[PDB]
Symmetry: C3
Subunit: 255 residues, 3 copies
Amino acid sequence: MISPLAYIHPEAKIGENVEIAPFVYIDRNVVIGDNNKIMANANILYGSRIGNGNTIFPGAVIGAIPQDLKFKGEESTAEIGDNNLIRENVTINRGTAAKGRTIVGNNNLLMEGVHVAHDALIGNGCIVGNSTKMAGEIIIDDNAIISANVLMHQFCRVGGYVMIQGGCRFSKDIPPYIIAGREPIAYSGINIIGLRRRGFSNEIIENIHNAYRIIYQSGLNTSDALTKVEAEVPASPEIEYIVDFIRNSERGIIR
Amino acid sequence: MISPLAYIHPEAKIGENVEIAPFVYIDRNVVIGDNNKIMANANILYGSRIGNGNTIFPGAVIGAIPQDLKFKGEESTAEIGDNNLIRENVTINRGTAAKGRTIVGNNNLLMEGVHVAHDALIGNGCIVGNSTKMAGEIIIDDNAIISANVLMHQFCRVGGYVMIQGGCRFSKDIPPYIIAGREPIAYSGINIIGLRRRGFSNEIIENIHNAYRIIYQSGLNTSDALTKVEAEVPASPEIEYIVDFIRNSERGIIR
Amino acid sequence: MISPLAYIHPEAKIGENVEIAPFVYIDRNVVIGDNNKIMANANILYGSRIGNGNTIFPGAVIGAIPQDLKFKGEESTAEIGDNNLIRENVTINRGTAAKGRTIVGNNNLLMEGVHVAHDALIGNGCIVGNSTKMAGEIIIDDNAIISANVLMHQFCRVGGYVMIQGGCRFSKDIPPYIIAGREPIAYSGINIIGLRRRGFSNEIIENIHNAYRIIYQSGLNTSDALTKVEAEVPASPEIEYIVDFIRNSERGIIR
Ligand SMILES: CC(=O)N[C@H]1[C@@H](OP(=O)(O)OP(=O)(O)OC[C@H]2O[C@@H](n3ccc(=O)[nH]c3=O)[C@H](O)[C@@H]2O)O[C@H](CO)[C@@H](O)[C@@H]1O
Ligand SMILES: CC(=O)N[C@H]1[C@@H](OP(=O)(O)OP(=O)(O)OC[C@H]2O[C@@H](n3ccc(=O)[nH]c3=O)[C@H](O)[C@@H]2O)O[C@H](CO)[C@@H](O)[C@@H]1O
Ligand SMILES: CC(=O)N[C@H]1[C@@H](OP(=O)(O)OP(=O)(O)OC[C@H]2O[C@@H](n3ccc(=O)[nH]c3=O)[C@H](O)[C@@H]2O)O[C@H](CO)[C@@H](O)[C@@H]1O
Ligand SMILES: [Ca+2]
Ligand SMILES: [Ca+2]
Ligand SMILES: [Ca+2]
Ligand SMILES: [Ca+2]
C-alpha cells in the first residue's frame, strides 16, 4: 500500500489504510490521517495536516511556504479535512504570521491547478474549478461553486451556494446564493439551478430572489435595503444569512 | 531507453523504441505505441491509450479519473493519437459513461497546463495555448488554433482553422475559419493569416470572407443567411463546411 | 544534501552547498551554481543555466525545448540568475535561433504556474503572479509587478515599477511606473503604492504623475506629448526613462 519508491520522512505521522504511490515526497512535521490515497509525484511538505478519506492527485503540492514576501520562516501549517479531492498540480501553501494556518474543510473538489494561498480558509462541500486562484487570507463559505480561471483577491469572502462564472475576477465580497458573472463582475441573478438541485423549496428560492431584488434592483443603499429585507421578506435562516453577510461585509459586496 | 528509475506496471503494453525517463509512473491497463518519448515525472494512468511518435513532457498527467462528480468508477479511456506534443502539466482525464473515451487525434500541440476534460474530442493538427481549459464533451475540429487561457464551456464545438484569441471564453459554437476575440467573445473577421500560411487561394479566402459578411454583417437571421450563402457564394467544400457547421450547431454560434 | 533518490547526469555541473531533493531530474548540459535549493520532483533540463542562491520548487520545469513550432533542434539555453524564487510548476523554456537564450535575472519571484517562453527576458527584482504567461521574445524591465493570470503577447515590453492587474491581457508595451488594468487594458494611473513603498520622493512621484497626465490625458499625440514632458516636467532619470521607453517603443504603448 505504501510504495517503497515513495520518499517518506521517518518522522511523518501516517494513519491506517493509506495508499502512497511511487515518487511521492513526504516531509517531516507532516500528519496524514486514515483512508487517504496519495498518487504519484505528489508532494506533502513540512507543516501539512491531512485528515481522512482524501485523494491527492499527481503533482499536487501541499504545504509549501507562502508566496508572500512578508514570510520570514515562522511556523505555520497547510491543512485539509476529510473526503476532499485535490486534483493535479493543486497548490496549498502553508500560513504566515497573519493567521498561521491555511485551512481547507471537508468534501471539497479542488480541480487541477487550483491555488490556495497562505492563510486562506475554505469550508465544506465546495467545488473550485480549474486553475482558480484564491489569494491570501480569503474565505469561502460552505457549498460554493467557483468555475475555472477565477481570480479572487486577497481578504475577500464568498458566501454559500454562489456560482461564480468562469474567468471572472473580483475584489469585493460575494453574498450567498447568487450568480456572479460578466466583466466587470456583477450580480447576475440567483443560483436557482444549484438551489433546486440541493432541494431548496420554491418558496425559499422565491424569498431569496426577492431579497436580492431589494438589495440590487430597488435603488436603495445597503442599510435601507437590508432594513426592507428584514421588514418585507418572510424570515428564514437563508434570509438572515444574506442580511448578516452583507451587513458585516469587510470589503463591501460586488455590484 | 527505459529508465530503471521509472515505475512501469508489468501489465502495461509498451511498443518499440520508447524512451522513458526517471520518475515516470505507468499504471496497468495502459497501451503505449512506438517511438514515444515520455519525460521525467510524467504520469500515464489506468485507461490511457497512446499512439506512436508522441512526446510527453514532465508533469503531464494522462488518464486520471474525470473531475465530473457524476463519475461512479465506470471503465473509460484517455487517448492520444500519433505525433502529438503534450507539454508540461497537461492533464487529459479519461471518460465517463456519457461517452467513455476522451480522445485527442494526431499532430497536435497542447501547450503547458492545458486541460482536456472527460469525453472531450480533439481532432488533428490543432494548437492549444498555455493553460486553456476544454470542459466536458467538447469537440475541436481539425486545424484549430486556440490561444492561452481560453475557457471553452462544456458541450461546445470549435470548427477548423479558427483562431481564438487569448483569454477569451465562450459557451456557443465557433464556426470554421474565423477569428474569435474580445469580451464578450465575438466574430472578429477571418483567420486570413492562418489561411494564407496554409496555402488557401485568395479566391477561396475571399469567398469565405463573403460568406461571413452575409452571416454576421447583413442583418439576416441564421436560416436566411445560410440560404443566401448557398445562393450567392461560389460553392466549394469550405463554404459547405461553414453552412453545414452552422446549420447543425448544437449550441448556436457565437455573435 | 544531494539526495540519492535524485537523478543527476554525471556531466551536470553543480556548485557548492546545493540541496537536491528526491525525484529531481537533472540532465546533461546543465550548470548550477552555489547555495541552491532544488525541491522534489523538479526538472532541470538540457541547456539550463542556474546561478546562485535560488529556490526551485516542486514540479518546476527549467529548460524544456520551445513551444514554438519553428524550433528545429538548435542549441539554446534557459537561464536564471541569483536569488530567485521559482515556484511550483513554473516553466522556463530554452531559446530558439531567434535569440538563443531565455533569460531571467536576479531576485525575482515567479509564482506557481508562471510560463516563460523561448527567448524571453526578465530583469531583476520582479514579481510575477500565479500562472501568468509571458510569450516569445518578451522583455520585462527591473522591478515590475505583474499579477495573476496575465497574458503578455509576444515581442512586448513591460517597463519598471508597473503594476499590471490580475487577468489583464495586452499586446502593446507598458511604460514605466504605471498601473495597467481593466478590459481592454488601460492606463489606470500611477503605481503610487509601489513607488511610496520603495522610497521614491513625493516630488518625484508627482513629476511622474504629471508626465503621464501629459501623455495620456492631454489630447496630444505621442511626439507632442513627449516634447511637452521634456519641456515642462522637472527632469530626472525617471522622467528620461518614461520618455525614452515610449519614444523607442517597438509595439506602441497601451491606451
Ligand atoms: C464538478 C462537476 O461534477 N462538474 C460536472 C458537471 O458540471 P455542471 O453541473 O456545472 O454542468 P451542467 O452542464 O450540469 O450544468 C448546466 C448549467 O447549470 C450551471 N450551473 C450548475 C450548477 C450550479 O450550481 N449553478 C449553475 O448555474 C452550469 O454552469 C451550466 O451552465 O456536469 C458537467 C456536464 O456533465 C460535467 O462536465 C462537469 O465535470
Ligand atoms: C505554436 C507556435 O509555433 N507558436 C509560435 C508562433 O506563434 P504565431 O505564429 O501565433 O506568432 P506570430 O507572432 O508568427 O503571428 C503573427 C500574428 O498572427 C496571428 N495569427 C497567427 C496564426 C494564425 O493562424 N492566425 C493568426 O491570426 C498571431 O496571433 C499574431 O498576432 O510564432 C511566435 C513568434 O515567433 C512564437 O513565439 C510562438 O511560439
Ligand atoms: C509577492 C507578495 O509578497 N505578495 C503578498 C503581498 O501582496 P501585495 O503587497 O500586492 O498586497 P497588499 O494587500 O499589501 O497591497 C494593497 C493594495 O496595493 C496594491 N499594490 C501593491 C503593490 C504595488 O506595487 N502596487 C499596488 O498597486 C495591491 O494590488 C493591493 O490592491 O501582500 C499580500 C497581503 O498580505 C499577500 O497575500 C501577498 O502574498
Ligand atoms: Ca466592521
Ligand atoms: Ca507538476
Ligand atoms: Ca439538432
Ligand atoms: Ca524603431
